[PDB]
Design a protein around this ligand. Structure first.
Ligand SMILES: NC[C@H]1O[C@@H](n2cnc3c(N)ncnc32)[C@H](O)[C@@H]1O
Ligand SMILES: NC[C@H]1O[C@@H](n2cnc3c(N)ncnc32)[C@H](O)[C@@H]1O
Lengths: 330, 330
């Protein structure tokens, strides 16, 4: 692809939503009877309901912007998006390539979190379904070739069309299907993975992807450059095709407030570090910090970047060398 | 209790809500990995979202009214309830004892149904929490002693207060905790059961109640007059303390459209038949018909009673004797 380069820009594709977050003051697992998983009938009486900006692409773009990166949000929203746009522009996110639906509502995420941070949610797409009409070729024409396109959870068809466009245009992409692994068939999952510079999942999603694709881990590692699997309280594994695994533990949290968007924040921080020339371990350390700041705040985009508190906390979790390197590049 | 009798009235206590019903075009069970039930992270992309009148008490009162029974709805709603009241009054439901909140919103049920009719939902109480301020003594003062008080899923505290009021007032009650078994502790469940004329659950809920109370089946049967356990496609079991079990299979359905409120409809039809002097088997046959009509319609209260179609279908499922008896009493 002989077209001109964007200056260090990440293009973030995926959902743009309003998040309705609720808390269940019990444990989902206690109500989940193995004997009955074939047909659950479950309704959780919640304590709390709060509304926040969301969507995986909105969350990740926000985080890249807060960290000072160049980032373009690519997704479909409803006519209400003008206000969300101002919020994202306040952190330096380029929103020029958001498709604004003429008729449909911005997507709605309705999520219940229990006391163990397990989550069970619905996602009503609305305008998200129009993302299949977005042409990444037009984005590239306007801003240049991105360093990386993130293929986040989106309209299912769009997830594939965007991946195919990256392949034919020679753009590096990150396969980041997260929540849609539940909706996507095995065939639909398998066609998103080949050639990915990164595959991101949490541990549950990794097992789910293997289960639904019928692939072994070796089948996956043969076709990607790096697997990144987050492990809840055990941190993150970064695994290369030759098996070399780098592990990074979490940043100790002060509160476990709301896990929504913690993975999105990790991905944003990690990819920011990678764009900034940091290695795998240093990038995942930075990612782990943004993750914990999202875990300690309600909502996905309700956290702040204070450079000296960040430096101090990185040093406290990983040593002074890591902290110096990381804050230095920001 | 020497106070005067209401003419054949059932008092229905429980939730009054707006239901947001969505469909997931896959299978929850396929996404439920036994290995991971300790901490699920699940978000279902849905195809569909429709809004309907609901709440277990609204559903059951509606159904009793449609069948011609005398019924009083007892629960808490928001100021929007005026419109829902007109709908229920159109079927002969007495709504005089609904508590209308001055500040809170009518409760919200957000529910996703998969292709196997499994369901996963949140329930935001809003005004429902004010049901704990309702005194059944005042209801009884106004209308007389009901034949039966149904203790449906409600504000948790209200569920217990209502049961205690029935006990001290000598009113027959039906323990019908259904969905709240997930929210209620073992102690909170156990204090709802003793002295119940009927205990209603579906099969999943029966196992859940046994699991969380630590009780054996014998522990439960010693303290209730009848256990009624619905069995999905296998119908319903009606079990007496001495072990005598009467089983009734389903009415064959033409479509499996939406299972929300099927149990509510069964309960309403069964209790209507019992109030009308029908035996256990005939009552559960009538209940099974109302259940299937709700299964074949979207929403909980969007079905109709056509006496000749009802007679024909009852005869088709249970024989002409049952149909003649049942329609005769209506
Ligand atoms: N990672 C957290 C973010 O994920 C969004 N989300 C949840 N389920 C989704 C889904 N099934 N499809 C697209 N986006 C989804 C949701 O909007 C939230 O802000
Ligand atoms: N049986 C179906 C009815 O149950 C209502 N419902 C669902 N979950 C509930 C819950 N947790 N508490 C009270 N009512 C609930 C819901 O409103 C629906 O109309």
């Amino acid at each position: 692809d002989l077209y001109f380069q964007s200056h260090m820009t990440i293009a973030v594709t995926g959902s743009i939503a309003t998040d309705h977050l609720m808390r269940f003051p019990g444990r989902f697992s206690e109500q989940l009877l193995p004997e009955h998983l074939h047909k659950v009938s479950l309704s959780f009486l919640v304590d709390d309901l709060v509304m926040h900006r969301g969507g995986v692409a909105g969350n990740m773009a926000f985080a890249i912007g807060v960290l000072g990166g160049e980032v373009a949000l690519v997704g479909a929203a409803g006519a209400d998006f003008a206000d969300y746009r101002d919020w994202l522009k306040a952190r330096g996110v380029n929103c020029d390539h958001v498709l604004i639906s003429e008729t449909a509502h911005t997507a709605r995420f309705t999520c219940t979190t229990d006391v163990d941070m397990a989550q069970i949610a619905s996602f009503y797409p609305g305008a998200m379904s129009e993302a299949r009409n977005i042409k990444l070729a037009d984005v590239v024409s306007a801003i240049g070739k991105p360093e990386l396109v993130i293929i986040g959870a989106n309209d299912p068809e769009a997830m594939f069309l965007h991946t195919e466009e990256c392949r034919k245009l020679g753009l590096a992409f990150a396969a980041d299907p997260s929540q849609q692994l539940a909706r996507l068939s095995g065939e639909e999952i398998r066609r998103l993975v080949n050639g990915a510079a990164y595959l991101f999942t949490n541990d549950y999603e990794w097992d789910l992807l293997l289960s639904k694709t019928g692939w072994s881990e070796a089948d996956v590692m043969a076709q990607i450059d790096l697997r990144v699997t987050t492990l809840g309280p055990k941190g993150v594994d970064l695994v290369e095709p030759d098996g070399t695994t780098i592990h990074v533990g979490v940043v100790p949290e002060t509160s476990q407030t709301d896990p929504t968007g913690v993975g999105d924040a990790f991905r944003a921080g990690f990819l920011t570090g990678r764009s900034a020339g940091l290695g795998l371990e240093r990038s995942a350390q930075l990612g782990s910090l943004v993750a914990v700041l999202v875990l300690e705040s309600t909502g996905t985009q309700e956290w702040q970047w204070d450079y000296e508190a960040a430096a101090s906390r990185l040093a406290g979790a990983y040593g002074e060398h890591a902290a110096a390197e990381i804050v230095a590049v920001l």
